[PDB]
Amino acid sequence: QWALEDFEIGRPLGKGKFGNVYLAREKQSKFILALKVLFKAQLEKAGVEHQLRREVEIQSHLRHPNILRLYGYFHDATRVYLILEYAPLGTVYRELQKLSKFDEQRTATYITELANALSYCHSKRVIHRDIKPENLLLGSAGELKIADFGWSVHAPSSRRTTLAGTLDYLPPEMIEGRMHDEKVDLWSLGVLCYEFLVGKPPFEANTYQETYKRISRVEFTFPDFVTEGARDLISRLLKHNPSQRPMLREVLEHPWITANSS
Ligand SMILES: CNC(=O)c1ccc(Nc2ncc3cc(C(=O)N(C)C)n(C4CCCC4)c3n2)cc1
């Protein structure tokens, strides 16, 4: 069906290792959307051309208000085109840059949305979404959208590289090279809850090497303003042992979440 001729192209919203994301508009409907362009040369060089095919099929069947929708896709001789939902308010990472840190009501509301999205994902055996805030977008209603599909893409305003942000969110079992399961998403939720409340991710260090040690040894501390309920949820999510991490339904029922979420 689709071809590049079906779209008007506007400015690049961001750029990544594999290509760019453009503001775009379907000509007939004048619908605004995000056109993600991946260069086949880059996909081939990295050896991920088979992984892209699988994730396109997965993404084509994920339908949830807090997951960025894939409308369709096509290709030409040099490029793959993903026709994505456009999230008009940008990344949560940028919101965090602007506000420095989130209050407990905003944080608990965002965590609720993500826990619901991740529960849906898990129900389809979809695990390990990279939910660093650079991959979380804000829809027109301010609702969170998981948008890690098709690899990282940064806006010009970003000050954290793809490798650094992804490392900040990696769980000990994947740094220690062990088997992992869907509990990696619970770990990521704890890192995110902390970054939301603090304005910095908990294991940030000068070097990647020190960050590895801090993650593996779960070495993090709380600023004085983090309330006891927030400490309790974050401490349960950032357990080294994945079996000790709560179920997503237990996150949603956590007293700090229910007391503060919209
Ligand atoms: C001052 N305005 C802004 O910074 C702004 C930035 C993006 C949007 N919309 C928007 N909509 C859909 C997307 C899909 C991606 C993407 O492939 N990611 C891996 C996440 N991205 C990225 C592009 C670069 C930042 C997120 C999307 N971005 C609106 C406003």
Q: Output DSSP code: residue 67.
A: B
Q: Output DSSP code: residue 200.
A: S
Experimental technique of record = X-ray
Q: How far is the CA of 150 from the centre of ligand 1 (A)?
A: 12
Contact status, residue 132 vs residue 42, Cβ threshold 8 Å: no
CATH architecture label of 4-84: 2-Layer Sandwich (3.30)
Give φ, ψ of 18 to 5 degrees: -95, -15
Find out whether 17 is annotated in a ligand binding site: yes
Q: CA nearest 230: which of 183, 195, 182?
A: 195
Q: Which of 6, 130, 181, 185 is catalytic?
A: 130
Residues with CB under 6 A from ligand 1: 13-14, 21, 34, 36, 84, 86-88, 90-91, 94, 135, 137, 147, 150, 152-153, 155, 157
Beta bridge partners of 33: 24
d(CA 251, CA 45): 40
Burial class (CB in 10 A: 0-12, 13-18, 19+), 11: exposed
d(CA 94, CA 8): 26
**130 annotated active-site:** yes
Element (H, E) at 197: helix 184-198
Q: CA nearest 13: which of 74, 84, 65?
A: 84
Domain 4-84 and domain 92-260, same fold? Reply is: no
CATH architecture label of 92-260: Orthogonal Bundle (1.10)
Contact status, residue 182 vs residue 173, Cβ threshold 8 Å: no
Burial class (CB in 10 A: 0-12, 13-18, 19+), 186: buried
Q: CA nearest 186: which of 141, 230, 251, 117?
A: 251
d(CA 231, CA 109): 16
d(CA 124, CA 256): 28
| 3-state class (DSSP) for residue 194 | helix
Contact status, residue 58 vs residue 126, Cβ threshold 8 Å: yes
For the chain, the domains span 4-84, 92-260
Buried b / exposed e over 83-119, threshold 16 CB at 10 Å, is bbbbbeebbbbbbbbeeeebebebbbbbbbbbbbbbb
Which phi-psi region, left, alpha or beta, contains residue 180 (left: φ > 0; alpha: ψ -120 to 50)? beta
Q: How far is the CA of 153 from the centre of ligand 1 (A)?
A: 8
For residue 13 the two structure tokens come to: 């919203």
